[PDB]
Design a binder for this molecule. Structure first.
Ligand SMILES: [Mg+2]
Ligand SMILES: [Mg+2]
Ligand SMILES: [Mg+2]
Ligand SMILES: [Mg+2]
Ligand SMILES: [Mg+2]
Ligand SMILES: [Mg+2]
Ligand SMILES: [Mg+2]
Ligand SMILES: [Mg+2]
Lengths: 373, 384, 384, 373
């Protein structure tokens, strides 16, 4: 069969909103690690609206955080359709409306979350989303270091993999759309994108002559970013996670502090699934957890291994309960989440980069020993 | 239900949630599709991409729209919030006195129109399973029913102290694919000051939970969390932000099926984020209704400027009655999955979408993508 | 009063108007100065330029601010609208549920600080006349008194059906500079549904108009227009837009004196638009109180980066008791009209300005620029 | 004595708001001449908010009217701090909540208005405001025709005249501040401003060696327009009228249709005062009119001639009532105001330009004949 996943660059207006929300969160967590943050961003031609509910002792400058975030993305001129130095920044932030052991606090909301891991790649992530991520990240890298200076921030990527008996056979189709300045024709752009973006990223074994390459398929891409389309926080939740390979509970990540289970329980679910796969206990593993508001223990825990489990399924569920703390604040302690580390997650994927806390496999050897070594 | 730790550790549990029409995110979805419906009523070929932001006191309606239609954004917004039920400042939001701002822009060829290419790239999923009579997953179906039942009894005066904002969550137990029962039910509903929590929980169990959840699925072990944190007076936009497209798992299958990431509301039928998901449900439902599988998941993907899908996958989870390769070929030939082919196949150029913006886009039999008029054809074509 | 056409065509008439604290423009002025006061309470040297936009459902607070202070714009705004009286959706606006947005930016040397140059150019006027005990023009004074009396009787429950939005207008007749009587009175006040117009007009005349306007100035000829168009239920921001700086003639002398065009509210004392107007009133009042003229008008102008005024003019309308050239020299030496000299002369670095944002910046004796502590000095210096 | 008045260019953020409000009014009056318009504009870095109440059968595009207005002003690049092509335009426009002869309609609001005229100049306007207006208009003219291309839209002017026995003796001080690009030093700017802006405008008879000239007095003026300061409709009402020489009732002009007496009764008051002065009946003349809401006849009419009347004062008041219709809708008929003619008034003065309806002196000869010819 075939499977397809997509990603977007840091200049995509939805991702601009996600990065602004988490930039505000990082600046608040730098001063107040226990802060409650629920920050929603709306970006359109000329303006950024930053809203939500915030409870903190921190003192931050929303305008300067927003402008710096958009400067780093690359929109610094009206020719690009958006300028961090001259756009409007509006604020509509308000306020948010008991246990002896803080680890026993009930969940601040109901909801369901999923985590996933698979053998297909080295980072234990599905191949389609990983290489879709690496294509848009390579586009930004080659734009910022001056290799292809005519590139502009907004870009999208899509990769279609072919699977046979659960194994990767190759790449069926590639889509790469990138914004650019007026000073380059489409033919030169397609050659440069193939040479400096696609070929360095996609492994040659998976690229045959039957592979379809769609580079700027409709032609010129000069108007981009917030100029063309609205951007809102939390409208890229499948890009942020597994590119559709695994399920999703619906909650967005960016702009939320670690006490929101929509974010931290999904981080912990990846942490569990990755360590299970890293331990050689399964080839593929999906975890579902759910919470009731005001209840500390998860209302449900599902472990699905798609027939690839190397130990019995009842054992795997036992291992998860034995080695992981899935209570809302227990996640925070287990993963050490009260740190300004979240703007870096707001683009190119929350899962797959080994330096995040939920990407450490520091429990894999323990899980091996606890089962048949 | 008080089940201690580690007593039934082997049960397979799955959980889904839903929200009422008063949830701020759903208010944004309803406003976006109400704007869409008003435009399609005058201009069925309009391009609409309407994003709504709702907060305490204000509604921001933005996006890009290309149409000959002439609509009143303020009037459409106030009427939608009126019907939802926010008409007084005691509820935290009033449709008659709130602010309505607009930031709508103006959106920056084939011999056969059905061969037009897609307007964007993307992936979309559809799903069906014979667990319910409407071929939907059980948890999301009964999660939808609970919050719609809450709206129903609030509006007809049965429980007049209810307020629009509400959420529900149901945890089902499965044993080898068949429903065995309900393990946990969550029901949080906004209310007025004229009711205590003990009288509220009794009224919720008698007027909402019991008329909806089958008695055969409720035992001594079922946990019931009705307003688990107590008082719920401040709600709606007063409490939280609402954004179009932030309830996309509520809108589809409640987590049982995967998702491509695209929102539905505010988008005209030429956006494959919405129309191809509707088509994906249409083929998944007709495959299951034809008796060719017990549960079926479909993924389609597109490339901008390309008419044919870049990929089509059918997943049957071992429940197929014919080889899965034959199902893939049947889907490609019996359904037009081209962007403008969907529109003609599902008859989508009509103002029908505001109704979809709350309580689920799938499961209600009067929607075009819920018709099962190809099941006997698919069954004939596959042999059986 | 029914005076037919062309009966008393020779009378000299002058008209002024005022508005209550519930008028949407005045709501914007009060919010701007409430933000200013909260900042000066923590940082007296702050630069503030706060502009407010009020509409149905929302308050937009914008401008440029350079300060070490830390203030809550939302809390300051809600409290100001609370005290004005808009606390329910039946009034068209509620302080507890409206939207508050912020768009505040960050504002793009002398051995003697008093020699610092002005921050902008501009012209400003001050005025005084011995027609009233507070040395203010009669029409604007009693126009202010009428709408403040309306707020007074609304807040203490005397007439509880009143609502905050109200306007007044008084036409005086003059004969060679002395008041002869009142020719027309207009009083429009917002109200609730629980009162008819006939009972409203009687209550307005008994509880507002009669306790304020001296009986000697009311004859058979006086026209009284109380709610002349009838019902006045929708009001405040619900009906109209409100903007900082759109009541600058209400804020000063009601048209009797000229104006430079600069608004007062939202501006810290380093803005000569406000401080030099306050100083211009200070010299005009002390000249009249010293007995050196019966009415006095002062104009000062500035150039950006220049400390001394670019021009100083004293106008006495033939009522001077000493040559007008001597008055100009007295003003230049007895008053420090340099931008930061004003501040020290009037002791302006204090949170006193929210009180000025409704019912007039001039006429209330407890304001610094209303003190008359140089009158005996000016009278000594001029001879008399 | 001395007297001073100021003006601002079309690029001043308050005037940008005034021009946008009346551009919206003009586009509506083009389709619906009887429309009710109360349009308020708020401009800040990156965004335009257009609000108010409108009752019309017209169909207009607020965004395109706004962008075209700012394009004509000259803000078309982020280097200038504002760009008509990429700024945000938000709309918050709503709705507005009987006579046999429409001329007998009551006034839609109470209020007081003033008109003024004087011999000092040819256009029967006070000298300070007229030459302040002509300095900023000359700045825009020389900027747009390419004479001084380094000029930018935002500018302010101020002129201080000296009077002796009611007659002009000369100009005491001049202030001219103009925005500009980075590519010119302050010395070259001051020489070019003196040669191409000040000297062509201010008459040489009034310029002595004692005249003070303040050109960009604090130095560089690169940041300007909405980038530095907020702009709001109706915050330049003294610039719009007589520069402080005459009184003002308080009402703003721009964004209001002719049925608002704040605007049309002030236009008619200038029309009366100008024809009186044009008729040689007085050297200076100020008119005050007032209205009660729902009442058609003005509540008061004052004629002040400052001792310069050539005929008795009681006669002048009679002439005003005899030759002018000051009822709210009667103003509209007398001056033919139901036409899209108002964007041109939103900068450089509503009074002084002879092609406006209220600037015609077509009743002057009649007023002469009705009195002692
Ligand atoms: Mg999007
Ligand atoms: Mg959630
Ligand atoms: Mg939400
Ligand atoms: Mg999409
Ligand atoms: Mg007003
Ligand atoms: Mg000023
Ligand atoms: Mg200003
Ligand atoms: Mg007015």
């Amino acid at each position: 069969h075939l499977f397809t996943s997509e990603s977007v660059s840091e200049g995509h207006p939805d991702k601009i909103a996600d990065q602004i929300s988490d930039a505000v969160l990082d600046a608040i967590l730098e001063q107040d690690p226990k802060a409650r943050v629920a920050c929603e961003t709306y970006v359109k031609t000329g303006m950024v609206l930053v809203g939500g509910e915030i409870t903190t002792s921190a003192w931050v400058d929303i305008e300067e955080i927003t402008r710096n975030t958009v400067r780093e993305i690359g929109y610094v001129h009206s020719d690009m359709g958006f300028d961090a130095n001259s756009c409007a920044v509006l604020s509509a932030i308000g306020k948010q409306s008991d246990r002896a052991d803080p680890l026993e606090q009930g969940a601040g909301d109901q909801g369901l979350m999923f985590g996933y891991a698979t053998n297909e790649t080295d980072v234990l992530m599905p191949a389609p989303i990983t290489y879709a991520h690496r294509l848009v990240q390579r586009q930004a890298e080659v734009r910022k270091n001056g290799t292809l200076p005519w590139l502009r921030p907004d870009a999208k990527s899509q990769v279609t993999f072919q699977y046979d008996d659960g194994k990767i056979v190759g790449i069926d189709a590639v889509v790469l759309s990138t914004q650019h300045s007026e000073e380059i024709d489409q033919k030169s752009l397609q050659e440069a994108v193939m040479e400096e973006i696609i070929k360095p990223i996609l492994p040659a074994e998976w690229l045959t002559s039957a592979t379809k390459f769609f580079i700027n398929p409709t032609g010129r891409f000069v108007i981009g970013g917030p100029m063309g389309d609205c951007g809102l926080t939390g409208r890229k939740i499948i890009v942020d996670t597994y590119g559709g390979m695994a399920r999703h509970g619906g909650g967005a990540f960016s702009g939320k502090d670690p006490s929101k289970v929509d974010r931290s329980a999904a981080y912990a679910a990846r942490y569990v699934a990755k360590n299970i796969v890293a331990a050689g206990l399964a080839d593929r593993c999906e975890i579902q957890v759910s919470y009731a508001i005001g209840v500390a223990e998860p209302t449900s825990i599902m472990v699905e291994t798609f027939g690839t489990e190397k130990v019995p399924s009842e054992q795997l569920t036992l291992l998860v309960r034995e080695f992981f703390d899935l209570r809302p604040y227990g996640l925070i302690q287990m993963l050490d989440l009260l740190h300004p580390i979240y703007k870096e997650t707001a683009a190119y994927g929350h899962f797959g980069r080994e330096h995040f806390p939920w990407e450490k496999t520091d429990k894999a050897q323990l899980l091996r020993d606890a089962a048949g070594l």
